Write a protein that binds this DNA or RNA. Structure first.
Lengths: 129, 129, 129, 129, 129, 129
RNA sequence: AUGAGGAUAACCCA
RNA sequence: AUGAGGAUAACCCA
RNA sequence: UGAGGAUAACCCA
RNA sequence: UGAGGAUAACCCA
């Protein structure tokens, strides 16, 4: 085992599929990036900390880039027009068993499942109403 | 097009699923809760706002109860020992189109798909290794 | 030659053994935990470093849960009442060869072999007499 | 009974076996040393203390010497080229029964058993990877 | 996945090979060490950092020891008569794609390939001429 | 005899090969340059000096350019969008024989051989993990 | 009391 | 530690 | 930044 | 000396 493996971040049925691979673990922060210039890459980082006497806190971040080709000084450089950032912090009490944690993961998956409220609003550039 | 409807948060294949229903809309902050006491309920809240001139920001929060050894409807203290808190912040540049936004949602779904690094780590009380 | 693998920490002759598996590697500090909630798990961590010009130092830590009258997966406070902590520091002069080091390991195994003074004292809630 | 007895610290199948014998109990610190000049001897000490209202703390130390013969002032003296030090502190809650303590001893024995991760790294002058 | 693994630093057929194995990864600095006495061991360290807005910078170091035995007072220790120190820094703009990095690596391997100017000058205790 | 000759810096089969040729040897600094526009050329420099009573020190440098065309005012020049900079310093005690230097060179070639930790991290825009 | 603080080791440091 | 605080993103603010 | 030194993740201009 | 920066045989502590 070793869970520090590559995985598909964006799935488009095996074509134009954004896959992300391990790329750094310096300072206890696991990092994953896509095969791109460090300036246009998708980035995912994760770290766990004993935030308190009875808490553990996962801090996960994702960076989704809008790739573009700029012309600085009359030369073409691969760059990102802009980036979208996901910042999630998950605090779990040390008393949570494995089955308790599986419950947290399922909640997070159901929360974002296609057709459910939240992902629908985000995808349509609107709020909940 | 009302998207503020109930949905399945925790899916256990029809039997033992956890449905979360609309429960509050004070201050534009939509809220959904399961059918439990508020100390033992699954809670989901979501709001959007113009964080700045350049970005919009979705703030999603989830609360998941510790179920192992739980006493349904009882008084369980300290509260911090029986609850996990998820806190998501999605920043999206105002230039993102409905398409760009669908891609961002896909990125979030991929991050948490079964068998992938992050969810596998969480479900096993582990970090990355 | 990867040595960061799972192993049997508590051996009860095949039946009721406690296996500890890799669970974190943040900051070069390897971690192993049993399949329990982190409040009731067996935890083992180990790191090495150059403590000084002349020595290297292994820092090994073990956490063992109090099992008698335990409620699997429950909330048990105060935490200090339900856990024992082992803290080992092994200082080895940089001149030690693989051989010198095998002897040191043998010394540690001998110290804790069954029937010997130290382990017998610990297992009976006693001191030396 | 009396657990203050001699024992084999380093075992090489009854030949070149480093045996250690009781040698001092002054100030509540039990001491054991091998049959050697006090300058080249293996040393083991142990002491138990009521470190807190609800804790007991064992403090065990082992000194493994690299024996040599120096020539100070043109004369030969038995000495130690260097020493390796083991420093372990074990904190046990007063609520731990005898069967709970037996669990701690077994964990410590399994931790150092031949072939397991930690003793392998130490013996090969490497880290965990 | 993991690239923080053991590897052959000096290749002498199959036998005489110098292998270096992971030992420490503290504060973003990976470190490999060869087996046996730390004092006569080969050392390799590596680290990456965002040296500026547009640059990432690798800092690699190698230490080749001249194995020898020091005798003083008739006491002998395994030491290194002296050490040779390699010290490189590689700067790469964030605009570099994986393809560009593969070129940079080939450039380094070419620089040191057998028979070329530089590796030959070094191997003969010479400079350019 | 002469080692200040032309050589293949980047090997791409037989075609696509980047060759560097002598260009200048002023003030103890040897310099190689690839053909065509100096502006988009690969550069390598080398020099040795008695850094101290016991040490000689080599200073090698490599520059990998990112070939591109700059257009300004409709006037276009062959330029380098950016450059990657290798920079190494090798210190070798005067006591090193030719055999020791051959080892030092093998150590460097091993460090950068295909598939090993470091050359792989660099080629993938990654660090250690 | 805590330190993946140090040691020349029943001592010393924060 | 808390923020439906900000960000140019393992940082900054109250 | 250094064809700046080193006892090497330190130090100097 | 620097896991100090660089536009790279220069520059900073």
């Amino acid at each position: 085992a070793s869970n520090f493996t590559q995985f598909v971040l964006v799935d488009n049925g095996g074509t134009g599929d954004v896959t992300v691979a391990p790329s750094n673990f310096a300072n206890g922060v696991a990092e994953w990036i896509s095969s791109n210039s460090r300036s246009q890459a998708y980035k995912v980082t994760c770290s766990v900390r004993q935030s308190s006497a009875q808490n553990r806190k996962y801090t996960i971040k994702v960076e989704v880039p809008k790739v573009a080709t700029q012309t600085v000084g009359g030369v073409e450089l691969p760059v990102a027009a802009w980036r979208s950032y996901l910042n999630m912090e998950l605090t779990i009490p040390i008393f949570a068993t494995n089955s308790d944690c599986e419950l947290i993961v399922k909640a997070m998956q159901g929360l974002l499942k296609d057709g459910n409220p939240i992902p629908s609003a985000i995808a349509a550039n609107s709020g909940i109403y």
